[PDB]
């Protein structure tokens, strides 16, 4: 089992902490959802290759530009997250996060991940977004942004229901394994 490193980046409300928790526990916490994620080493077998994938979060580091890059050394794959119920978190991807991740992690594959896809057909979400003249991110808007920033791929998932979560991390392992 080779060792690879994964770092999740994105705005505070992109749902990156919850994605790391649901993946590591293989369950959406029934009794208590933790506020923080420390670290985890996942045993993943993708395409017949066994990998030890270390998972890291950047939550809490968004306002601290000199503390935050300390999470980047030797990263093998970046999960660049945004929330499907938040068109604003998608806007910050090519402006702030992509130039930072390409400067500290040159040549590292990036997977643009659209979180909270369950809210794309949630009525409370649709009514709330209309007050600010917005609507949920469409799957093609995500694909276009992923193409624009030169991401390795574009994927979607829902931490609430676990749908698409295993595939995100299995594709990250595949990307981390490539030259």
């Amino acid at each position: 089992a080779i060792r690879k490193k994964l770092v999740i980046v994105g705005d505070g409300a992109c749902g990156k902490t919850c994605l790391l928790i649901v993946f590591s526990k293989d369950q959406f916490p029934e009794v208590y959802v933790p506020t923080v994620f420390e670290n985890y080493v996942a045993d993943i077998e993708v395409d017949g290759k066994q990998v030890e994938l270390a998972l890291w979060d950047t939550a809490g580091q968004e306002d601290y530009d000199r503390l935050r890059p300390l999470s980047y050394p030797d990263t093998d794959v970046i999960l660049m997250c945004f929330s499907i119920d938040s068109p604003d978190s998608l806007e910050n991807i090519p402006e702030k996060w992509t130039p930072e991740v390409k400067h500290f992690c040159p040549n590292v594959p990036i997977i643009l991940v659209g979180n909270k896809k369950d809210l794309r057909n949630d009525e409370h979400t649709r009514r709330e977004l209309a007050k600010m003249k917005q609507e949920p991110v469409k799957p093609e808007e995500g694909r276009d942004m992923a193409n624009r920033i030169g991401a390795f791929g574009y994927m979607e998932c829902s931490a609430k229901t676990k749908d698409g979560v295993r595939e995100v991390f299995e594709m990250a392992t595949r990307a981390a394994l490539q030259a």
Binding site: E38, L67, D74
Partner: protein
């Protein structure tokens, strides 16, 4: 880590740590506030455990088994004794607040009502000046430490056997040398998230809401000072 503390913090939440009959006696809001306070102490216990792996297992093992030059070991684990001293003191005060709160005849049922004052003390005065000075030095030496580690691992065979030996047990799966360094660096930025969620469920007593609000600001001031005093050293 000691068996007493590990057992007290083995459960995934405060709601599962306390007896079911005691849990039923509390309002939903108190259960939520206690769940987040328990998470803060449980993650602090894990953090102090991480610094003990660095001092006793790695640092000490390199000095005694490998007989490595003290300046080399210092380069690898900068400020580890000062860091260990800051958080073992903080953890002691948190577990003593839990201990005083225990119901008579019980080793698990408790409710902490005054966390705010403990957080204001920790993130103010001399203890805040020491955290700021220590993390500014540790974080500024982060890259130099990883570079020194990679060099030693790739050039010395006895160092590689040592690392493979001490990190072999399953209880060390997430705690390699570089993993421990990033765990410690990321610790300080976890506090505002934990304090804010405690504050969200602490509106019952106005004094507590004010203390936690002051504490949140002192943590953010500290983080801003550490962030501004960082510059990556390069050898």
């Amino acid at each position: 880590s000691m068996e007493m503390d590990e057992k007290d913090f083995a459960a995934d939440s405060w709601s599962l740590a306390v007896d079911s009959s005691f849990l039923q006696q509390h309002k939903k809001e108190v259960m939520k506030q206690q769940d987040v306070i328990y998470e803060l102490i449980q993650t602090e216990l894990h953090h102090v455990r991480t610094l003990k792996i660095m001092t006793r297992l790695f640092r000490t093992g390199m000095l005694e088994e490998l007989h490595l030059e003290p300046g080399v070991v210092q380069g690898l684990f900068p400020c580890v004794d000062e860091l260990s001293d800051i958080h073992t003191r903080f953890l002691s005060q948190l577990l003593e607040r839990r201990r005083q709160a225990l119901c008579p005849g019980s080793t698990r049922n408790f409710v902490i009502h005054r966390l705010g004052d403990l957080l204001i003390s920790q993130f103010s005065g001399p203890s805040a000046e020491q955290m700021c000075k220590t993390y500014s030095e540790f974080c500024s030496r982060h890259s130099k430490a990883l570079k020194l580690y990679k060099e030693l691992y790739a050039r010395d065979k006895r160092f590689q056997q040592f690392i493979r030996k001490v990190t072999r047990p399953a209880v060390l799966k997430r705690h390699g040398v570089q993993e421990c360094i990033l765990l410690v660096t990321q610790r300080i930025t976890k506090y505002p998230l934990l304090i804010s969620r405690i504050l969200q469920h602490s509106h019952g007593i106005e004094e507590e809401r004010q203390d936690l609000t002051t504490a949140l600001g002192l943590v953010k001031e500290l983080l801003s000072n550490v962030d501004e005093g960082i510059y990556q050293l390069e050898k």
